[PDB]
Ligand binder design. Sequence first.
Ligand SMILES: *[C@](O)(C(=O)NCC)[C@H](C[C@@H]1CCNC1=O)NC(=O)[C@@H]1[C@@H]2[C@H](CN1C(=O)[C@@H](NC(=O)NC(C)(C)C)C(C)(C)C)C2(C)C
Ligand SMILES: *[C@](O)(C(=O)NCC)[C@H](C[C@@H]1CCNC1=O)NC(=O)[C@@H]1[C@@H]2[C@H](CN1C(=O)[C@@H](NC(=O)NC(C)(C)C)C(C)(C)C)C2(C)C
Lengths: 302, 302
Amino acid sequence: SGFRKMAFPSGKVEGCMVQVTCGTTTLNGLWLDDVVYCPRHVICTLNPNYEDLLIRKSNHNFLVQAGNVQLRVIGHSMQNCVLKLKVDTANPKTPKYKFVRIQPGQTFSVLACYNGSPSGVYQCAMRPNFTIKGSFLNGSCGSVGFNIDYDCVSFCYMHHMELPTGVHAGTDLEGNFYGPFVDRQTAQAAGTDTTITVNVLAWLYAAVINGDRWFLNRFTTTLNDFNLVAMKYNYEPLTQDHVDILGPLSAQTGIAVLDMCASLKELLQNGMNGRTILGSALLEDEFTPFDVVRQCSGVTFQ
Amino acid sequence: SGFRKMAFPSGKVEGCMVQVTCGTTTLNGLWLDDVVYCPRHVICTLNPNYEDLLIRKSNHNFLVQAGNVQLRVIGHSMQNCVLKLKVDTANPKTPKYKFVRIQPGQTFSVLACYNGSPSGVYQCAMRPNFTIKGSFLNGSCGSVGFNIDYDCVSFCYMHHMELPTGVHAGTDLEGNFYGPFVDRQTAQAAGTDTTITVNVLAWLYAAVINGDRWFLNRFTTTLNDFNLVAMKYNYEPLTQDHVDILGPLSAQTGIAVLDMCASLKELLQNGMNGRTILGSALLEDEFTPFDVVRQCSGVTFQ
Ligand SMILES: *[C@](O)(C(=O)NCC)[C@H](C[C@@H]1CCNC1=O)NC(=O)[C@@H]1[C@@H]2[C@H](CN1C(=O)[C@@H](NC(=O)NC(C)(C)C)C(C)(C)C)C2(C)C
Ligand SMILES: *[C@](O)(C(=O)NCC)[C@H](C[C@@H]1CCNC1=O)NC(=O)[C@@H]1[C@@H]2[C@H](CN1C(=O)[C@@H](NC(=O)NC(C)(C)C)C(C)(C)C)C2(C)C
């Protein structure tokens, strides 16, 4: 038992991290097969026109270091906000992998990197407003977020920028930003965030699986009446699809999803009254139903 | 910016995990050079006498799987509560490494494993009562906790058992339990835990580095008067050694350690009043001064 914010084992991704240097800019790249992926703002020279900027580059302007081994760029292209550098060497540590664009509410592990070297790994959620509350300093651009399914690394995030609120914005691995953000230094605001309701419910189920039951009650609620209270507390609407996803957890604990909603409603209306759930004095919303099941049942990855 | 419970990149340890099977018992082992380390209760047959139990084993009773490759045991010995299996093959992925017995208050990353396969990684502290609040299911015995310094993996923990409170107990990699625990099914109680004061202070400094300042005040306190309030709230005593360790953070933020103690005192006496610090509504104590500096300055590992 116990319940922790668990990241995926990061080794498969560590083997893909490289340093990309061009001009005075150094950041991280992702080396899969013979392509290095990195944020396009690595290129030389607000309101830049990256097409103009890139047509002016030569391959030899791109310094790619994989450890103490320089990789030479034999080609380059831009795909949305990512730059793709063709190199003459296929990464021998390339895992089996996919690129996935995730939905808000979904979680992933971030391998924070500086100068191509991994610094740490932690678990993130994509917020409803398409930011992530990460931990990123200058030099971390190009660090990636990922999930692992059996043996396959699903890359879903690459880091680009920090918003004035101290939260983070980036792209999928095909260079499309999550949310309304653009990779230029112009005024941009995240958007009002909301709490991921289905995830809070998943985490209450984790608490029950783990022996916290104090927040349960005998009441029930209608999805309709629950969502009325949710909106008042800035919670995302709970859909029937969410209820269905919460099915496996509801069945393992014997607590009807709608009964768990009654508990959450009472927790929203009354607060926690100096008590904690799973070591937290806040309602935690960065565990998906899948996260809870994986950690409470012990799924591994080969 | 941002501040997250960050684990070390786990790849160097992932390459060392193996499955050890003996009789009907399967758990994880740690393969470094030509030795596999695992908990000694993997052996056949409360109040067992493991010396008697082990003299009755043969090498061929030990099934060690490294992936889809069986390793054959050519020797075995017991060192405290760990079993050491000599195998005929040196692990080619053996990182540079050390075994370290850590002090309570120190943090480490845990690579949770089942059947030799990594499940996830998360950050833990050794509690003052020498338990860890982990996330461990049946099959996780032999998963290890570690820190990484530059290129060196410092192994500090191997998992053995769960206590009735849902917390965890284990050994260093030389098989010595942390705390008063023994690897037999007899009544054992953890001991009253306390909050790691120097770590809470480190985390308040992380909050300041990151732009939370609301909890600061103009007051100061004496170490003596602080510790009187700490004891009342079940906090560990703060020593002058702790104050010195907090020096670098105090200097970078310009807040005297003893001034930060005044803030903590006021936070203990008044609570947080519905406010949060670094996303938490509790005073967080599983970040060391070193953790804070590493994450707020971007140290990496090659
Ligand atoms: C990233 O480029 C990097 O690490 N590069 C190494 C040289 C860096 C990561 C940032 C730095 C601090 N925390 C992070 O996550 N990203 C950028 O520098 C990014 C690049 C420039 C400006 N960038 C920012 O993140 C800036 N933020 C904004 O300007 N934000 C708004 C106002 C446009 C929304 C800051 C101010 C943090 C440098 C571009 C967006 C292309
Ligand atoms: C570990 O042996 C394992 O994973 N083995 C694979 C077959 C297992 C890990 C435990 C299981 C649940 N959570 C965990 O961390 N450890 C044990 O089974 C351990 C071994 C037996 C009994 N063990 C326990 O952890 C037991 N706890 C106690 O008996 N605790 C007290 C009362 C002695 C303090 C439980 C009840 C959890 C099985 C020995 C201690 C040798």
